Design a protein around this ligand. Structure first.
Ligand SMILES: CC(C)CCC[C@@H](C)[C@H]1CC[C@H]2[C@@H]3CC=C4C[C@@H](O)CC[C@]4(C)[C@H]3CC[C@]12C
Ligand SMILES: CC(C)CCC[C@@H](C)[C@H]1CC[C@H]2[C@@H]3CC=C4C[C@@H](O)CC[C@]4(C)[C@H]3CC[C@]12C
Ligand SMILES: CC(C)CCC[C@@H](C)[C@H]1CC[C@H]2[C@@H]3CC=C4C[C@@H](O)CC[C@]4(C)[C@H]3CC[C@]12C
Length: 1350
């Protein structure tokens, strides 16, 4: 059962954390209306969760008012997601608004499949919030059906499908309202007839917001609130809002128009229907450069709109047509998806294209491109930005993009961003770290804080193994194993502590050395510093990638850095130990754990592989690389690391074994056999000079090298132990004297020296636990203990005979252990050593044989002893009789003569004529016994040995190869002098320790390899690493499975190509099948405050017609009546019309182009307009009596696609002119203005063009603009159909066209609306333009002159 929530985490307005507050306290801010009349309203009692049939999960619902804040509703959705999925839920990087048809519609299956596939891919990759209407009809129901499969096929996080619906139309509203909130799991009955509503809610939507205004059955109350919520969500999550238009009626066109106007991009699904097909045609008409769109015309679009929506009136059709053409004006904000052009799997690419055309900046576009997993798009965008001189923005956003690529596990994107000159060690954290009192932590660079941010961000996720690893580690902040609190928690995932955790994971004495001092600016001049900074940075990132088990990024950082082999071994050890750990146990963590083991093996393979390649190329150089001491792991070589990582595969390799055997012999040629080194040992001056060598300067150096060799110390220890065995053996065989003899004193000194060496090893080397673990140290302790017990037994009373006998008895055991201990030196041999390991394995079979024989031995022995002597008291002799002869009869010594004597049988035949008949059963029992022991048990032991031997021979060989290094390491650190004389070595070490600790008169000296040989080793290792990876990749591509898989995919691609072929075929099938005028101005005068003219019909406008019923209204605007400089005087007397007239000595164009001319009224002296009646006398808004000369500047260029081809419509080339949107009435118009005093059309045209299209106004661009402005042609001088025109003042225009044939000069113009223009843009010229006044006639004249489309 589901427990109702009592408290909710509401995110703060600062966006930093969530505060917990009661549900009843939070919900008070939402209101509901009981009736339409109500405005203030009452609190909402309708909120909770709804349970829908055949749906497992419940959907939350909140009924809120129209006046309610959309931020509060956004907080509600965030609170629900925060409760269900935890605080660290996947934030949306995309808001998908689905609008369209309210009524039900059927789409084609392929188109539906393409939309469904693309929308599911986009939604699951970006964690997008899909906002629809929420009702169970049409596009909302369709979107629900698309997201239903996403909710079924995917686990954990499901992207919300928010439905915002009006409450006044919803079935079942009263049931939802009445009750005590919250209603947990309330049943919704969509088929129940709740009067008078017939609209049900979609059952596949994950949340519901019911917006109420008190009305009933009045749809569309929530359209604005929905737009406000989408905009609010987009600002809050810094995510683009993408509207998707499928189908769609007349209101969808206005919705899409609203969406474009607010800057929100739209994706129109072509082939769906109605508004979408109309919008798709219209865009294709205004932008697409393909050959099949060249036949597109407005007439056919108008025909399409008329046949599809069927308007009642022509004005409605005109308004729909104007709005439809207005939507696709800006090509960036509209993206049309079509099946026959883009493709079935290209809808998410179209969504990404809309996103890239929406927000213009490199960082947002690259982050979204990462989210959709389109590297090619990101690569092309980066290349285009690189070519166009946008390198600064690239460098400014590359870090944040690289950080984002690391967080979301995208290695290919990591490789891309790193390739475009982004330094790996220049990473910066997103937040700012607070200052810390610790000097080690304050020394840390920026990229360390960036790695700390990656650890923190990954760690805050639910059920993360990193948090368990850090908590179970039981360490402080700097990683030391010591177990205030606030720092220890805010910076718990620092890099030093993580380095310490990984160090414990490798072994007990692994300590990685960091040097962050090299990242200061003072070291930049040092040669090769950029490599070192790179390498260290790479290493730290590498370790982070090993911890999160991301193999691909780990492999990438491993290949970027250096010291490949050692890093692979360390990685293998950390992953193998990490997979079997307390932090990774759990039912849900199983598969990753598995992954870890897999990854471990892979790294191990790498470590072996590279090494192998090295041994193929140069054996000596490979030997040199394995001997190199590396500073980062406390100055020791790769074999030491490999032993610490327990890499049995690496140690058993022939190259590694060759270096271990080269370390043996102390690097000399002729020292190879036992006899050669033994002969050279005894005879130093007679075999060493005449031998291959790798003055007192040289002979002394070779002597110090030969006797410093570990093999020589082994030979010295063997010879020493052999003399000890021989001398102790003679001592125990020869009789003891009546006093302590000289040989006894020599043996006493020898065993004290041995005892002191064992104590020195215990206190000063490994540890007591480590010493006792070894079996040979235990044997050493037993032999010293036995000798001292025997020696003190003799020395207590030397003349006592009994003491001599007991002392030799103890010393018998001493000689047995001494000769048994001599076997320890057999382990160095390649023949005797593995066999010794095999003997220790076969001891369990020996124990099995002993347990089985013991049964038969005691059973037969008690029975036989009782049978031989049935009338004897039990004594110690009875017990010996039970074990003596039974045990020795299994080795073939049968005491049948002795048994015959004991049985008292006097016959010649062996057990006849006996005193008792029972004793005649003595040979029968024996007969059974030796059948059991010799024929059965011994032969089974032979069978067990053969089986055991075959099983553990290879493992014994591998274990011997690890022990070869162990023995080499052991005899490297050992004291130089042999056992009897080691006391001198002990006193020498004590003297050095006293002189070093107290005296401080000496130090340690060593040799450091040059940088030349170091970079030589580094180059070799890097080259062979690349060579092994190439060989490994080629070998994996030549496998049979890979070839079968690749041929299979090729056959799949072949069908795909046939599918394309069939589409082209069906297209021909279709192709072959089809192969067989008076102007009357509006009544209300503009900008006059509602003053209206005298209305006249269009058949009464001409001046030739009489029209006696004419009573115009005299109105003059306040602006004209205030008398500015460009306005003529209110009294028109003394002014001459029909000729160029001089005002203040400057000529103005007062002559009209009308053939009749301007007529002067006799009564008032005012001029009369020759272009017809306008129902208004006076000057109105026009400043000049008669002809107001205006100049219009049509700056044109050919509309070209990026490829360079000119766009073509109706068989004519299409022009494009700069058009401005007027400030006063928000209608688009041609830029222009009245001709000033003393100037011509050239100056007026240029000044108006600079003022309107350019606003404020260089260098070359000014020269291009001057070159474009130097060739203008007066195309027309006509009368304007301007609504401010009256009978005594009318506008007459001169049109000047500035055409850019090449298009170079026009492309440098930065269009930006200024003065009395709101926006300016390039707009294609056509006959369906809704422009101000008679500017269509002027463009018609421009296109007529240039033979362009109209
Ligand atoms: C761990 C192993 C190798 C050591 C075995 C212990 C040996 C050294 C000890 C343990 C018990 C000892 C025996 C105990 C009793 C006696 C009886 C005495 O009248 C003569 C010596 C003799 C026979 C001892 C000889 C030494 C002895 C066998
Ligand atoms: C126990 C199973 C395996 C087989 C049984 C065989 C036993 C019961 C048989 C085999 C050999 C037999 C013995 C052979 C001969 C003699 C001599 C006779 O004057 C008295 C009985 C005596 C001493 C027999 C006693 C029973 C005996 C021990
Ligand atoms: C193939 C193998 C198992 C052959 C079997 C041999 C058996 C049947 C033989 C071997 C030795 C024999 C024993 C040898 C000696 C004596 C003592 C005699 O006073 C009675 C019979 C008795 C006790 C025999 C019984 C049978 C005997 C146990």
């Amino acid at each position: 059962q589901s427990v109702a929530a009592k408290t909710l985490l509401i995110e703060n307005e600062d966006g930093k954390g969530s505060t917990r507050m009661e549900v009843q306290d939070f919900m008070k801010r939402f209101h509901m209306h009981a009736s339409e009349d109500d405005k203030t309203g009452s609190p909402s009692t309708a909120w909770g969760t709804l349970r829908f049939p055949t749906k497992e999960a419940t959907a939350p619902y909140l009924r809120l008012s129209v006046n309610d804040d959309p931020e509060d509703a956004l907080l509600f959705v965030k609170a629900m997601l925060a409760q269900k999925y935890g605080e660290t839920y996947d934030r949306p990087s995309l808001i998908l608004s689905v609008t369209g048809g309210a009524r039900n519609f059927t789409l084609p299956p392929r188109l539906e499949t393409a939309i469904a596939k693309g929308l599911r891919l986009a939604a699951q990759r970006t964690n997008a919030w899909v906002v629809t209407g929420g009702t169970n009809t049409g596009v909302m129901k369709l979107t629900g059906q698309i997201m239903e499969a996403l909710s079924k096929t995917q686990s954990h996080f499901i992207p919300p499908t928010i439905g915002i619906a009006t409450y006044g139309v919803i079935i079942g509203g009263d049931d939802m309202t009445r009750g005590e909130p919250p209603k947990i799991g309330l049943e919704y009955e969509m088929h129940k007839k709740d009067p008078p509503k017939t609209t049900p809610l979609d059952d596949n939507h994950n949340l519901f917001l019911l917006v109420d205004d008190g009305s009933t059955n009045k749809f569309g109350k929530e359209i604005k609130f929905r737009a406000a919520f989408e905009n609010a969500a987009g600002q809050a999550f810094a995510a683009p809002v993408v509207t998707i238009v499928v189908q769609g009626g007349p209101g969808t066109l206005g919705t899409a128009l609203q969406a474009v106007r607010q800057g929100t991009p739209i994706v129109v699904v072509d082939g769906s229907g109605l508004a979408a097909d109309v919008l798709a045609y219209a865009y294709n008409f205004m932008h697409n450069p393909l050959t099949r769109f060249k036949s597109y015309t407005i007439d056919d679009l108008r025909q399409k709109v008329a046949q599809t929506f069927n308007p009642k009136s022509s004005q409605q059709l005109t308004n729909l047509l104007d709005s439809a053409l207005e939507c696709v004006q800006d090509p960036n904000l509209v993206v049309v998806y079509s099946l026959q052009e883009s493709g079935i799997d290209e809808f998410d690419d179209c969504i990404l294209k809309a996103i890239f055309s929406s927000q213009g900046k490199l960082g947002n576009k690259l982050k979204q491109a990462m989210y959709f997993d389109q590297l090619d798009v990101a690569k092309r965008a980066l290349s285009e930005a690189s070519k166009n001189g946008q390198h600064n923005e690239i460098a400014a956003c590359i870090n944040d993009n690289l950080m984002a690529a690391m967080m979301h596990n995208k290695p290919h994107f990591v490789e891309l961003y790193l390739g475009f000159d982004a330094k790996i060690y220049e990473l910066k954290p997103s937040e700012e770290v607070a200052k810390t009192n610790i000097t080690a932590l304050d020394e840390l660079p920026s990229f360390a804080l960036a790695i700390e941010e990656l650890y923190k961000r990954e760690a805050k996720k639910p059920h993360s193994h990193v948090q368990r690893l850090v908590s179970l580690s039981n360490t402080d902040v700097l990683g030391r194993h010591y177990r205030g609190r606030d720092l220890a928690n805010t910076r718990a995932y620092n890099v030093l502590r993580m380095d310490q955790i990984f160090a414990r994971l490798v072994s007990k004495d692994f300590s990685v050395n960091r040097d962050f001092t090299i990242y200061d600016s003072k070291y930049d001049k040092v040669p090769g510093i950029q490599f070192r900074r790179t390498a260290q940075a790479s290493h730290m990132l590498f370790l982070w990638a090993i911890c999160l088990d991301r193999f691909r990024m780990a492999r990438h950082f491993w290949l970027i850095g250096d010291q490949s082999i050692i890093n692979a071994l360390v990685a293998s050890r950390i992953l193998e130990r990490l997979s079997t750990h307390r932090a990774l146990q759990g039912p849900h963590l199983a598969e990753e754990r598995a992954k870890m083991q897999h990854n471990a093996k892979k790294f191990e393979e790498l470590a072996v592989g590279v090494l192998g390649e090295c041994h193929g190329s140069d054996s000596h150089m490979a030997s040199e690389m394995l001997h190199s001491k590396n500073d980062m792991f406390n100055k020791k070589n790769a074999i030491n690391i490999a032993y610490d990582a327990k890499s049995l595969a690496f140690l058993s390799h022939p190259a590694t074994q060759s270096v271990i055997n080269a370390d043996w012999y102390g690097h000399l040629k002729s020292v190879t056999s036992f006899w050669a080194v033994l002969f050279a040992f005894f005879f130093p001056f007679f075999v060493l000079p005449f031998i291959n060598f790798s003055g007192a300067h040289r002979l002394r150096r070779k002597f110090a090298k030969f006797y410093s060799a570990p093999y020589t110390r082994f030979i010295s220890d063997l010879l020493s132990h052999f003399v000890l065995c021989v001398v102790t053996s003679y001592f125990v065989l020869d009789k003891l004297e009546d006093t302590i003899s000289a040989i006894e004193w020599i043996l006493l000194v020898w065993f004290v020296a041995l005892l002191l060496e064992e104590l020195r090893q215990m206190i000063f080397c490994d540890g007591i636990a480590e010493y006792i673990s070894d079996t040979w140290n235990r044997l050493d302790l037993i032999m010293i203990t036995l000798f001292f017990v025997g020696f003190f037994t003799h020395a207590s009373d030397p003349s006592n005979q009994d003491s001599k006998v007991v002392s030799k008895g103890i010393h018998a055991f001493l000689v047995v252990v001494l000769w048994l201990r001599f076997m320890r030196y057999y382990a160095l041999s390649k023949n005797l050593g593995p066999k010794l390991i095999m003997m220790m394995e076969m001891m369990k079979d020996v124990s099995t044989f002993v347990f089985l024989l013991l049964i038969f031995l005691i059973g037969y022995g008690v029975a036989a002893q009782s049978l031989l002597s049935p009338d004897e008291d039990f004594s110690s002799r009875t017990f010996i009789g039970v074990l003596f002869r039974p045990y020795f009869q299994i080795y073939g010594e049968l005491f049948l003569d002795d048994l015959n004597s004991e049985a008292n049988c006097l016959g010649d035949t062996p057990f006849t004529e006996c005193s008792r008949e029972t004793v005649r059963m003595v040979p029968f029992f024996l007969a059974v016994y030796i059948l059991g022991s010799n024929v059965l048990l011994v032969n089974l032991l032979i069978a067990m040995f053969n089986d055991t031997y075959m099983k553990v021979q290879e493992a014994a060989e591998d274990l011997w190869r690890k022990q070869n290094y162990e023995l080499c390491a052991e005899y490297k650190d050992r004291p130089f002098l042999p056992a009897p004389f080691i006391l001198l070595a002990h006193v020498h070490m004590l003297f050095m320790r006293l002189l070093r600790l107290c005296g401080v008169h000496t130090q340690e000296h060593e040799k450091i390899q040059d940088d030349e040989t170091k970079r030589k080793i580094t180059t070799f290792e890097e080259l062979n690493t690349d060579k092994f990876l190439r060989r490994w990749e080629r070998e994996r591509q030549e496998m049979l499975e890979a070839r079968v898989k690749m041929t299979n995919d090729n056959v799949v691609q072949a069908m795909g190509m046939m599918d394309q072929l069939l589409e082209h075929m069906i297209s021909f099938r279709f192709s072959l099948d089809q192969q067989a005028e008076w102007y009357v101005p509006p009544e209300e005068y503009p900008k006059s405050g509602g003053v209206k003219r005298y209305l006249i019909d269009a058949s009464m406008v001409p001046l030739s017609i009489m029209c006696p019923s004419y009573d115009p209204v005299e109105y003059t605007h306040p602006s004209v009546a205030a008398q500015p400089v460009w306005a003529d005087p209110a009294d028109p007397r003394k002014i001459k019309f029909n000729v160029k007239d001089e005002v203040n000595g400057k000529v103005v164009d007062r002559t009209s182009c009308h053939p009749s001319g301007i007529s002067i009224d006799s009564n008032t002296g005012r001029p009369i307009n020759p272009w017809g009646r306008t129902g208004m006398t006076g000057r109105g808004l026009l400043g000049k009596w008669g002809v107001n000369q205006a100049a219009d500047t049509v700056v044109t260029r050919w509309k070209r696609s990026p490829d360079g081809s000119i766009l073509e419509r109706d068989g004519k080339k299409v022009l494009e002119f700069v058009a401005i949107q007027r400030q006063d009435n928000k209608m688009w118009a041609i830029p222009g203005g009245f001709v000033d005093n003393g100037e011509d059309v050239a100056l007026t045209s240029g000044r108006e063009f600079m003022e309107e299209a350019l606003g404020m106004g260089s260098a070359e661009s000014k020269d291009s603009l001057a070159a474009l402005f130097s060739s203008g042609t007066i195309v027309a001088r006509i009368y304007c159909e301007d609504p401010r025109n009256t009978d005594n003042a009318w506008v007459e225009t001169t049109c000047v066209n500035f055409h850019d044939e090449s298009g170079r000069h026009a492309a440098r113009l930065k269009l930006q609306g200024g003065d009395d223009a709101e926006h300016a843009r390039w707009m294609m010229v056509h006959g369906g333009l809704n422009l101000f006044a008679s500017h269509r006639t002027l463009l018609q004249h421009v296109t007529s002159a240039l033979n362009a489309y109209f």
